[PDB]
Write a protein that binds this DNA or RNA. Structure first.
Ligand code: MG
Ligand code: ZN
Lengths: 162, 726
DNA sequence: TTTTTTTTTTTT
DNA sequence: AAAAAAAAAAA
RNA sequence: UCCACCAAAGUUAUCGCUUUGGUCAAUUAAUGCAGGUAAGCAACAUCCAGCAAACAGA
DNA sequence: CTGTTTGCTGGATGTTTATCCCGGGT
DNA sequence: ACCCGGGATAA
């Protein structure tokens, strides 16, 4: 189980870091895709991708590195790849999963859950957990709005793996 | 050497430099309007002259030399040396001026300043002359035959004779023989007499018909004689001396309440049509150059407007023998590039031989062409346990056409509907002066709005076609974003949402801002809005944040964006052409995949005629496309190929009763007999059963292809069609 | 050689 | 009912 | 005033029939197909005659 | 049983280029 | 004496 970290900057001012742990042994393909996007090996990555949808008490979302408005996102395998498995459930906060527009439509967009979401089980794949920086996650969430619009531009400046 | 021309299609947005786009739009609009007015004014002059004196020499005026003067009369330019004008030009100009002022008032038209309009006039007048000649050559004989039948009162006499013989209890064949030898033969005698220009035998026609025939024959010169003693042949051989007569023929049709036909070609479409862009036209109108452009610089000028290095303009053909010669055809959206190889400086299977027929063993594909199912294809090796069947239906080809039709139906402004309904009260094909003038005035009354609506792609638009309209974004089940019906983009992260139905006011009031921001960044949306409107739209979007509950901002933004609801009709036509090509290639690929690369195609002999209450069907074009792709295509007759059971050669019948397939007709005729399902009368045809009465059920296309296979096998084994299908 | 005419396909 | 097709009857 | 494609079944080579499993570039986007640097292939405009869709008038 | 606008199908015919001179500028 | 349009004829 590898780990990945992101640096979060609001309006050009760094605000904190979030550390993730990936379920490589459980969801190898999705974890590999996320690691590749985080490391930029394939010539493209989350570097500079904004968080375009933060719903307070519900979720943070991001990963759109081609349009920055939720209409973009591509995976290493191509436009989309099928869902791998559902061995994990949205039973605890801090879970990192993939956003999709339906079955077998996974791309590069991801989201982090701040509260349990039992209604999302069987609809999205969970492949990570936040191990550190959850305080930064709450800090960013406090700037969100119910509609998902952020009070300030929040982007990922740097990303890395450990 | 032999000459070939190949055309390649593209778009203005791709090859045309942005700097020289508006001049092209202005030129296209002006040329289309001038051509339409040229057609209208030519018909007006012809009808005015022919409606006052029948001795007018109308035959000799159907030439490009007169159409050019008619076209130029609609353009204002500095006068030249009048004493150097040609003799015929003076007469043409005088004749045009005799009615120029009246026509301008009738059509409410003013000359449009357009310098260097000679080449455009020549190009458009060549097409006008071609249209006139083609229409006459095509329909003169048929309309003459129709008039001949009407003069003899064929239908009236047939009905009278039939109803008189019915009272006498005559037999069917006796009635038919009486009709043949009392009506048809004298009618044929009249046909021959009119064909050879000689009056028919006395008594075959009444006084009115004799007078009408005299009037028709007075159009031709007294000493003129039809070549080869056939008017139908002389029309094709020497059309020049028939146009006037044609007009008279048309008049006689209107004298008998027959359906009017367009004797004089007219342009009635409001969407701008393609115009020929030449090197001189590009130099004078688009490049705005004011000096002669010789052939040496011919390409260099084209290099300053479009890129010649792209695939569209590159040489093409075997050994790259076809080259672009500075001639295009464009309407402001679609562009056609012509390439030529020379300088511009002025069968049935039953009739095949053994050697050819017997080489197709194991490669024949039997096709049954239908109406709804365009192609039902079966291979020879097809078996009940291995269905090697293919179906190509009308829905696949008509997808795009039906979508565009529904879009136009739903998005048509009420004002355009009212204008079309009002214009519906004036026929155009009529040759009467009153109706033509009425149509001219009616068209002048609605031309502004119709052109503005249909020219929205490039013309200046200020009218608001959608008053009291509110627009709200929607998302479908596939997460695609639509404004009302305009696609925006596919949201790939839309499904993740909180508990169902978050009906809070703030969410539904603020998601509009997010959708608007997503939409405005789209290229195909931003390109349609200028900076003037975009700045105000963004300013209103900014204010929406402060007061989401206010509705005035949404109404104002909807009013501003109402322009997006107009449709790109020309680009829709271009997309239709692309969709047709894609469907053809998809069908070819499916044929090569399902059956084989070297499959031999056997197609039915159905002519697929255009029938009322059914959509047009593609039959000849389908065969031409199939042959162009290298498929050996052979026709097989469909005689008795669907009325017999392949299993036992017994007759078939229709038994199943189904609600009307077309939903709109269900309220009128709720149920009808099934047409595509048949059953075999022979009870023993089906496999053994405990006398349950079950009978084999067949799809008519499947039975047809099986019978085609039977016929092919019989031909292979004996070279003669099976007796049952004689 | 030319014009009706018989039988059949598709579907209403 | 209504459009074209192959082939036969009529002159 | 509507219906994209591929397979199983009611079922029998079963219908503008029906229930399922699989695909989705949506499109008011643009020269299309096929190839991985180029490189090859593809007739277009106008008019007319029929038919189709919306509305109107006998 | 007709009419306007659009479109689908099918048939028929094209798809440029110098040179001369008057009026104007001057 | 020199130059600059722009319609019109024509194969
Ligand atoms: Mg058939
Ligand atoms: Zn049978």
């Amino acid at each position: 189980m590898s780990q990945v970290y992101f640096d979060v900057e609001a309006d050009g001012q760094p605000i904190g870091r979030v550390v993730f742990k990936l379920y490589n042994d459980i969801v190898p393909k999705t974890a590999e895709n996320f690691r590749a996007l985080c490391t930029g090996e394939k010539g493209f990555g989350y570097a500079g991708s904004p968080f375009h949808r933060v719903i307070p008490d519900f979720m943070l979302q991001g990963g759109d590195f081609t349009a920055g408005n939720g209409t973009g996102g591509k995976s290493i395998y191509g436009g989309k790849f099928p869902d791998e498995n559902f061995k994990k459930h949205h039973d605890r906060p801090g879970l990192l999963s993939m956003a999709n527009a339906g079955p077998n439509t996974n791309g590069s967009q991801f989201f982090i859950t701040t509260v349990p979401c039992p209604w999302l089980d069987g609809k999205h794949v969970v492949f990570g957990e936040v191990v550190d920086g959850y305080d930064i996650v709450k800090k960013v969430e406090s700037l969100g709005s119910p509609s998902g619009a952020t009070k300030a531009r929040i982007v990922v400046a740097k990303s890395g793996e450990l | 050497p032999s000459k070939r021309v190949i055309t390649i299609k593209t778009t203005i947005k791709g090859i045309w430099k942005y700097d020289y786009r508006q001049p092209l739009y202005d030129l296209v609009h002006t040329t289309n309007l001038l051509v339409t007015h040229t057609y209208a004014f030519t018909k007006y002059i012809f009808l005015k002259e022919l409606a006052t004196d029948e001795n007018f020499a109308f035959n000799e005026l159907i030439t490009k030399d007169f159409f050019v003067e008619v076209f130029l009369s609609l353009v204002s330019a500095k006068a030249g040396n009048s004493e150097r004008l040609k003799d015929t030009t003076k007469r043409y100009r005088s004749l045009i001026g005799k009615h120029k002022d009246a026509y301008f008032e009738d059509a409410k038209y003013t000359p449009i300043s357009l310098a260097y309009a000679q080449q455009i006039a020549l190009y458009e007048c060549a097409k006008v002359q071609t249209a006139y000649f083609n229409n006459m050559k095509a329909h003169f004989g048929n309309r003459l035959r129709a008039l001949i039948n009407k003069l003899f009162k064929k239908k009236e006499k047939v009905e009278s004779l039939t109803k008189e013989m019915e009272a006498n209890n005559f037999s069917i064949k006796e009635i038919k023989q009486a009709i043949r030898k009392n009506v048809y033969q004298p009618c044929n005698q009249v046909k021959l007499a009119i064909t050879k220009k000689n009056m028919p035998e006395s008594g075959l026609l009444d006084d009115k018909s004799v007078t009408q025939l005299n009037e028709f024959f007075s159009m031709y010169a007294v000493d003129y004689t039809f070549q080869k003693e056939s008017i139908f042949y002389d029309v094709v051989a020497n059309p020049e001396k028939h146009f006037k007569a044609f007009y008279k023929l048309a008049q006689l049709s209107e004298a008998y309440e027959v359906k009017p036909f367009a004797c004089f070609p007219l342009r009635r479409t409001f969407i701008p049509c393609y115009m020929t862009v030449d090197s001189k036209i590009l130099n004078y109108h688009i490049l705005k150059n004011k000096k002669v452009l010789k052939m040496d610089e011919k390409f260099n000028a084209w290099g300053r407007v479009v890129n010649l290095e792209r695939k569209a303009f590159k040489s093409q053909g075997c050994k790259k023998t076809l080259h672009f010669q500075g001639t295009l055809e464009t309407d402001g959206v679609g562009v056609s590039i012509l390439k030529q190889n020379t300088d511009t400086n002025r069968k049935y299977i039953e009739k095949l031989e053994d050697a050819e027929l017997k080489q197709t063993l194991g490669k024949c594909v039997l096709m049954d062409p239908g109406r709804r199912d365009l192609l039902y294809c079966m291979k020879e090796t097809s078996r009940a346990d291995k269905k090697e069947i293919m179906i190509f239906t009308k829905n696949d080809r008509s997808k795009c056409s039906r979508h565009f039709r529904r879009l136009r139906k739903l998005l048509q402004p009420s004002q355009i509907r009212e204008a079309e309904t009002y214009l519906s009260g004036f026929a155009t094909k009529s040759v009467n002066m009153e109706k033509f003038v009425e149509y001219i005035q009616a068209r002048a009354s609605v031309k502004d709005i119709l052109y503005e609506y249909y020219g929205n792609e490039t013309a200046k638009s200020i009218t608001e076609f959608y008053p009291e309209s509110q627009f709200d974004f929607k998302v479908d089940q596939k997460c695609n974003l639509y404004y009302e019906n305009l696609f925006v983009a596919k949201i790939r992260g839309f499904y993740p949402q909180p508990e169902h139905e978050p009906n809070d006011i703030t969410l539904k009031s603020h998601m509009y801002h997010t959708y608007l921001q997503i939409m405005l960044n789209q290229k195909h949306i931003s390109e349609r809005l200028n900076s003037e409107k975009r700045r105000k739209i963004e300013d209103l979007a900014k204010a929406i944040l402060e007061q989401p509950h206010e509705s005035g901002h949404k109404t104002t933004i909807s009013s501003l964006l109402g322009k997006l609801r107009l449709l790109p009709f020309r680009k829709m036509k271009f997309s239709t052409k692309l969709f047709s090509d894609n469907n053809d290639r998809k069908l070819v690929k499916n044929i090569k995949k399902k059956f084989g690369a070297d499959a031999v195609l056997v197609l039915g002999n159905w002519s697929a005629p255009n029938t009322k209450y059914q959509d047009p069907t593609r039959n000849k074009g389908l065969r031409r496309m199939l042959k162009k792709n290298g498929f050996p295509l052979y026709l097989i007759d469909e005689f008795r190929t669907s009325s017999f059971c392949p299993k036992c050669e017994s007759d078939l019948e229709k038994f199943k009763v189904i609600p009307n397939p077309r939903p709109h007709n269900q309220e009128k005729q709720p149920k009808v007999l099934c047409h595509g399902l048949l059953r075999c009368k022979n009870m023993s045809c089906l496999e053994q059963q405990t006398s349950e009465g079950n009978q084999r059920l067949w799809n008519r296309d499947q039975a047809a292809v099986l019978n085609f296979r039977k016929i092919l096998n019989c031909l292979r084994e004996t070279k003669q069609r099976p007796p049952l299908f004689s």
